């Protein structure tokens, strides 16, 4: 999936994806749908996950420490939608930037990892349809997936990764 980026990320900045951090969609729509978006909390929300990696990044984790066996998701409070939900992945979805503007990842494997996370969330919440939508807004640091590589911050429009439905 092509992920456009404002400052052309160099080839050296092509980290593996070793987890993520999401936030629940508040409200009460009786329709059997549970919407998750990229986190909206401050840096404290990401630090509370304890997935300290060699890369300081928003939206999704990079070059961190992966999971032992399968995906592990720990949230300080599930019913509470204000507190974010962390995620560690079993296998990483490598994200390689072409060097120019775009930064591309797998076209389909991302859908597979999304379905895996969606089932791991189904088991936690109601066994119902799950939807991944993009960020609800915020500052350019957290609205656009930012990562601090080699002394430079690179922002990328992650709108291409969160437009999925799973029944």
């Amino acid at each position, epitope marked *: 999936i092509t992920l456009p980026c404002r400052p052309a990320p160099p080839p050296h900045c092509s980290s593996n994806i070793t987890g993520l951090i999401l936030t629940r969609q508040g409200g009460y729509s009786n329709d059997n749908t549970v919407i998750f978006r990229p986190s909206g*909390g401050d840096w404290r929300d990401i630090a509370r996950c304890q997935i300290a990696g060699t890369v300081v990044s928003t939206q999704l984790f990079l070059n961190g420490s992966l999971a032992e066996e399968e995906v592990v998701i720990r949230s300080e409070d599930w019913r509470d939608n204000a507190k974010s939900i962390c995620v560690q992945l079993n296998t990483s979805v490598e994200i390689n930037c072409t060097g120019a503007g775009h930064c591309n990842i797998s076209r389909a494997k991302w859908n597979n990892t999304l379905k895996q996370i969606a089932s791991k969330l189904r088991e936690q919440y109601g066994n119902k349809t799950i939807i991944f939508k993009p960020s609800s807004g915020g500052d350019p640091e*957290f609205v656009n997936h930012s990562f601090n590589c080699g002394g430079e911050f690179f922002y990328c429009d992650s709108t291409q990764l969160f437009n999925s439905t799973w029944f």
Partner: antibody, heavy 121, light 100 residues
Framework: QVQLVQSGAEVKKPGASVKVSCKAS????????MNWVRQAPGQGLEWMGW????????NYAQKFQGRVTMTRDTSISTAYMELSRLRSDDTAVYYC??????????????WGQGTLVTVSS | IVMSQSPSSLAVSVGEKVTMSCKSS???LAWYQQKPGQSPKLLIY???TRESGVPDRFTGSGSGTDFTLTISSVKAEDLAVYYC?????FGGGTKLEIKR
């Protein structure tokens, strides 16, 4: 000496947009999440959304997505809730709320005085 | 994860003992009192934890999906509507009227 002061009541035509303000004084504005609660006229309280005053990230209610946007101005410590596609059935009293402890939300100790927005032709 | 609050209306005499229920669907529950013409005030902020300055007659209880608010010695000033909140959901109802 904490104080949350909202804007004044006003009228908008169906489909227009209304931006309600919330000036906060008496604490570190960037510490406590800011929520916006709408009280329908005699029909109970329904929460709309919350905004983080640092990252600016927002979590809206599934009933208001695609119709609301929350923003902030930390230089003057003012939250903003803008509502577009204004339906005539959305005339209510809009409050801004904070919470007692910076860690936990949803225990609104402070409230604004209110803001009665009216929507009619 | 909806919630209901009962009874809707409730008329009583001064000094009488009042007890209202809130059925959800040491938990994080709150009770707000909205007096005529004012914004809500947080009476109880953790199922049974009264706010600073809240007189002692107000007591909250409950652990499971059911909870309860109670006023021992009602007073004319306690006339108001009472809301029970869990996370992002408010119960509504429970208007405390006064006999005279």
């Amino acid at each position: 000496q904490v104080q949350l002061v909202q804007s004044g009541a006003e009228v908008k035509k169906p489909g227009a947009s209304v931006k309600v303000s919330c000036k906060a004084s008496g604490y570190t504005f960037t510490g406590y999440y800011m929520n916006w609660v709408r009280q329908a006229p005699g029909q109970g309280l329904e929460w709309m959304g919350w905004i983080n005053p640092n990252s600016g990230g927002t979590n809206y209610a599934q009933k208001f997505q695609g119709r609301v946007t929350m923003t902030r101005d930390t230089s003057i410590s003012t939250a903003y809730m803008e509502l577009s596609r204004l339906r005539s059935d959305d005339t209510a009293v809009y409050y801004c709320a904070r919470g007692k402890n910076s860690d936990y939300n949803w225990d609104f100790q402070h409230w604004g005085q209110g803001t009665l927005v009216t929507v009619s032709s | 994860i909806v919630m209901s609050q009962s009874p809707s209306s409730l008329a009583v005499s001064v000094g009488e003992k009042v007890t209202m229920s809130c059925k959800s669907s040491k938990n994080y529950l709150a009770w707000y009192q909205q007096k005529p013409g004012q914004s809500p005030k947080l009476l109880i902020y953790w199922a049974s934890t009264r706010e600073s300055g809240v007189p002692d007659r107000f007591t909250g209880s409950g652990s499971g999906t059911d909870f309860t608010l109670t006023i021992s010695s009602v007073k004319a000033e306690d006339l108001a509507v009472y809301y029970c909140q869990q996370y992002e959901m408010f119960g509504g109802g429970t208007k405390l009227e006064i006999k005279r």
